[PDB]
Amino acid sequence: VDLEETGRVLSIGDGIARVHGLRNVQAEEMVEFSSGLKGMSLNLEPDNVGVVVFGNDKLIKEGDIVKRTGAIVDVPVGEELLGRVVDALGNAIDGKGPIGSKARRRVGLKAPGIIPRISVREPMQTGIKAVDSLVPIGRGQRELIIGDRQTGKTSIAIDTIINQKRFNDGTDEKKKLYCIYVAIGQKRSTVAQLVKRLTDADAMKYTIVVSATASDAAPLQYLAPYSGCSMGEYFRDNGKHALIIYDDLSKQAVAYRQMSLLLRRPPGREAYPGDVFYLHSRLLERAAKMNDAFGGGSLTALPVIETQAGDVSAYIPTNVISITDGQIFLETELFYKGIRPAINVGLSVSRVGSAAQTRAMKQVAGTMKLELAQYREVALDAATQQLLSRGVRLTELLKQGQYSPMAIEEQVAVIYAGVRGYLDKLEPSKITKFENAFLSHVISQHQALLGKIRTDGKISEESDAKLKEIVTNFLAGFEA
Template sequence: GEMVEFSSGVKGIALNLENENVGIVVFGSDTAIKEGDLVKRTGSIVDVPAGKAMLGRVVDALGVPIDGRGALSDHERRRVEVKAPGIIERKSVHEPMQTGLKAVDSLVPIGRGQRELIIGDRQTGKTAIAIDTILNQKQLNSKATSESETLYCVYVAIGQKRSTVAQLVQILSEANALEYSILVAATASDPAPLQFLAPYSGCAMGEYFRDNGMHALIIYDDLSKQAVAYRQMSLLLRRPPGREAFPGDVFYLHSRLLERAAKRSDQTGAGSLTALPVIETQAGDVSAYIPTNVISITDGQICLETELFYRGIRPAINVGLSVSRVGSAAQLKAMKQVCGSPKLELAQYREVAAFA
């Protein structure tokens, strides 16, 4: 979709092209647009700023700073929608991406370049796992001697309250974790097109590190809200609705985003982009439409349960349902030896508990 500009200065993206009309979704307030306004083509596809200048900043879905700290210093611009790396350019996941949470690192290990879904009901600590992972990289990054040893973090907040995002910025800055992080925020009060675009913008920023031989982690919090925003846009554009009124290409919406997280081969710089998408379920229904879609795209999932959360088990991980499809390839030797027995013991415990 090409960017267009209205005479009021509001930008939009052309998504429907028909004989008599063009369907444009607007990135901004629609109140400034009136009948008879001129709409100009910008001649460019949607792009966002990327690079080290973004670290420590809070930006909106179009990469415009919203933290009141002035304009961005020197940066490059990257397209929001690019094709994922091909098979030849990839390498299988083999380095650990340690979250610093024992339950995750021992039982569902995550490797650099993996996509691991965090799924659970509301208020089960999904965001807490993601934020703790960012905070725990502080220790690792302070010991790093080169760029390739640092893990840069991108956090994309989709459809969250502004107060929640502000609180998050405060937590990260107090822990000095903002210096290696980028925050992309499309809050609940932002128009649906911005909530739809934010994950792709964040991904483009993360890809800068991946393609330059560095390592990055991207968190999409959460993709359920992006799907809802996309449904809203599609229905307004008169696209035929499918299951749960989502458009037919809602699977492609997420698959093309998550396929961009990859481990690059040594010939292409050996960089990596690890993705931790978050999905919110309703009453623990993991078999709903969007959850099953994203489970089938990712390389494993961390399932969180309300019952465990209220029993004081935190992170509230259901070890039986959680899985990492990369498995022990993403663990250090020492970790493998230690973690063999707890897995077996937990399985035996669940077996006995089922009869009790």
Template structure:
């Protein structure tokens, strides 16, 4: 009886058995170099697709499609991957998990927290690293100011929400300082701005210093740091700016304004060059691959101001590029200059002479111009750049002897000296726009003519302190009230005698 029952059970199992097959698109690792792996297989892989090594919990992104091989960049610890490991296609485009909780955190290029807070960031939405930029019909003109709090920029090289403004200069000229001051100044911005600082190939100690300063000023309450330090693989450095842009696009879709600092795209280009050489792509000028321009154009084109129909949000980009010996005609700088909507050029000579921020007003330009300024700022700062340029020419001419100069020329030189002193500004001390307007109004209308050049700094410090308690909007009224009690210890007359 037992044998009959067993036979019946086996017959039932065999009759009900339905064979199932699972077809998976897989690839086997042939080699791994500095975060880049060459795989055999993955015949159905797509560019930018996410693939997984399930056994080791490592993700990668497809970057190169060959006839028989696929090149991928490994996200995470690439030393865990070895020859013979298997990756499986997911059919998904590489993306980063984002939610409102990411604000205030430090994450790597894959969205993994690095700030030691120990809590995972909840994911509200997966944002693709690569995305086609908004079409022309989906955008609106840049017309809302993004105040940096830096007098020289807000008055002469204004930045609007949705603009791409390049910060360019030699090493150690204050490029990052301008970016950090801009982030700090968004504390009082209305509507609010979500700031994203993307560190590419920077030292960990430098990023820690920036994080400490942002914490001290309260700016981390609205800031995200995407960190791909020099110790990370070139693969992580390559995708870091795309991850930062994907985070910004999450807030863009919600109708919010965001600001991205790419620090810096020179190191990003170096990382991409190294990736391309490992992938055996044909090198071109300076060993960069042929698509080096497209690398940055498709990144920066995602910065825009959407139409009101799509929420009216914006992404403002401040990419940073380092030059060598002031050469702005080098390959990467000229590429990015042609992509952006203007540039803020910093000069080593001015920086070393103590004129900081060391902005060269002659070369620096904003292609948005007065459209990104308030009416009051546009009115008072309209001739500031011209006055400064004329002063530089007259100052150079006066070095041959000032005895024969007419009174109008002497007045222009004296006014220019005070403008230059007024534009000096300490780091981490951004100014409210009302204070900036009043300061420019003061120098344009002769309020500083009776103050010696060496005393302009004292006036500025006292006036800024006065403006912290003064609520007046009219600059003339505010200045008249201030000078009614201001003690002029050093006068311009004393200086001349």
């Protein structure tokens, strides 16, 4: 009797089944328990199998027969998770019955090759000016969303997601980004609202929501990203662009550590196990911006880290930091001020963001970015007072609260205005007001122009003169 493929639950911690037997099991096999649970024969001990139980028991009582499934894990992967809330096993906690994903693919598959990979050149946008502007961003890219709590964080992801609506629902094949929200340890409620929210916002049709809620068993919660990852590659390699938002890995890590510890497989720094950089590294290395062989596709990773008091020195954050291609650092004070964006800009980073995005924005943004620096810097001179004026104007201008995503052109337009100091000839409150009106004004009128600007991929000088004129007309013409 198999005590070489099957085992009797020798002891079960309460989630680590020490299982006598199983031997012939191959390492990292999904097993299935006589509690109906799943397990992974993770630890092939020379005696018994540490089987991480992929389930919740009090079903298990010792002696329970632990059965091989005989399989190393794959997950259903596909493209039909778009419009689906799922759990990692590939079951769909959406309660939309079960998903359409059906091909299965090892989550254990790894990092693309250099040649398979092809550097970012491909924009990535959020409808959030500050982001798109101040982060110059491509797709494939890891960028850390780092911040503590939806403090719009979560909002942030949403506005982006929502933003993709116009694109995915646009025929932006290239900007047909499958959103993968791996919801790691999130309250169901949060998700609920969220789910609802997104649904209401319906980005969701072109969206996977992998939902591992707060309760969810740890290896599962842990697993979910890898799952998601497999699924996103599913697009990637398939030409398409998936965006996985790994939300959030802090919780994953925790779970994971915990998991380790329960396996009595040691901790490490901050009681956290040693591979944990590696953990993500291998995961995220599986994310890529591909070459053409993969239809050029991408899996853009917006991993999320929830800091504890913005502490990132923190081994795991440092870890992550050393991997990411930048971070979106969020700062409370501005949020709290109501300033959304709330960001600490300094702390938000793109090491070399600009090599995969858009002239339009670029043309105004570089210079602007700088002006803001200057504006910011100085903790009166007409100049500086000006920078401040501007700066503040621009603050409004980059201020788009939570629930505000956009087509880019709208953004560049307004930015342009501000960079012409047009806005400095306005009270800052009325920048915002103006902006709204203005926006509906250009939307109305110069949708023509915007259409074009969107068209040129850049801002034309010509367009600029029309725009200038537009803006000015609106400006002047609604300056009060």
